[PDB]
């Protein structure tokens, strides 16, 4: 089984998402903000990470840049999932390291298949 790192500081978020990757077979491990994200990552390496933006403590551009500091952290896949839209949000996304930028509410069908184009 893949393992699914799902960085939100909403619950309900992470509950929809999480009761998605399972009906795949994923295990998912949750971190409710960057930080949280951070030292779990610490500990292993999941085979993608699906990371929010706006979060308390720590946020998701910050995650993005303290994942491309670390050589066992750089090359783990990320899609950012955000309610967040607009071009900039992307670009700096982008710059930072993400693989993939998609928006809240978020379709669970368009999700799926994107996890699927990186994990499968
Ligand atoms: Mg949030």
């Given at each position: 089984?893949?393992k699914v790192?799902?960085?939100?500081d909403?619950?309900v978020?992470?509950?929809?998402?999480?009761?998605?990757?399972?009906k795949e077979?994923?295990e998912?491990?949750?971190?409710?903000?960057?930080?949280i994200?951070?030292?779990?990552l610490?500990?292993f390496t999941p085979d993608?990470?699906v990371?929010?933006?706006?979060?308390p403590?720590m946020?998701?551009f910050?995650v993005?840049?303290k994942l491309?500091?670390?050589?066992?952290?750089?090359?783990?896949?990320?899609?950012?999932?955000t309610?967040?839209?607009?071009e900039?949000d992307e670009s700096?996304?982008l710059?930072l390291?993400?693989?993939?930028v998609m928006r809240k509410?978020?379709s669970?069908?368009?999700?799926?298949?994107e996890?699927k184009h990186?994990?499968?």
């Amino acid at each position: 089984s893949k393992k699914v790192l799902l960085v939100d500081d909403s619950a309900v978020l992470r509950k929809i998402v999480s009761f998605n990757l399972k009906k795949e077979g994923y295990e998912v491990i949750e971190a409710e903000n960057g930080q949280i994200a951070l030292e779990k990552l610490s500990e292993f390496t999941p085979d993608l990470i699906v990371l929010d933006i706006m979060m308390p403590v720590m946020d998701g551009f910050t995650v993005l840049k303290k994942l491309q500091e670390k050589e066992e952290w750089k090359r783990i896949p990320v899609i950012v999932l955000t309610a967040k839209g607009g071009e900039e949000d992307e670009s700096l996304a982008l710059s930072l390291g993400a693989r993939k930028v998609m928006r809240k509410p978020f379709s669970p069908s368009q999700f799926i298949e994107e996890v699927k184009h990186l994990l499968n």
